[PDB]
């Protein structure tokens, strides 16, 4: 699984893009995360978003990484 670290660093990168639309996969190969704002929370200011309740996350599986 994508680690908590990975997920949070991705959230830090795309904070200003974060919306109710699912983000791209955070990785181009291997397993990563997609994130979005829970639609019922579209109204909240972005610095009021609760990590567990307003940020939805799911694993996205891409092609294997080269070695």
């Amino acid at each position, epitope marked *: 699984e994508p680690s908590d670290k990975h997920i*949070k660093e991705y959230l*830090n990168k795309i904070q200003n893009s974060l919306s109710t639309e699912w983000s791209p996969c955070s990785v181009t190969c291997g397993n990563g995360i997609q994130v979005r704002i829970k639609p019922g929370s579209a109204n909240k200011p972005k*610095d009021e978003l609760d990590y567990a309740n307003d*940020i939805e996350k799911k694993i996205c599986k891409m092609e294997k990484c080269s070695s």
Partner: nanobody
Amino acid sequence: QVQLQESGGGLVQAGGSLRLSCAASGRTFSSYSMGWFRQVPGKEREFVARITSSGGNTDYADSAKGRFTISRDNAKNTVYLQMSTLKPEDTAVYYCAADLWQYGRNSRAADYDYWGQGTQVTVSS
């Protein structure tokens, strides 16, 4: 990774005030959102306050709103918890925690990444 060490806990009379400190190793302190939790026997840590890495915005549990103030000094690599109007029910071990998510709100112990050793606050009536 960073290492956290809390201090400032002790014995305080009810109605009193107390300031706890939590210092971090390394030079990446400022990239972490910092939280304070507290723990009583038989129960898991409960959220007290949070201060984000990006913009120093703050958030408070219901038990702490109006009474407590969380602040940080990144030059000193320290986050602070200023508590006032202390009651016996506030007796607990107080923990600081670091969270790599730099924005927003976060009140679950499971969703923080690094933990201090805790400092005991005893409030007598």
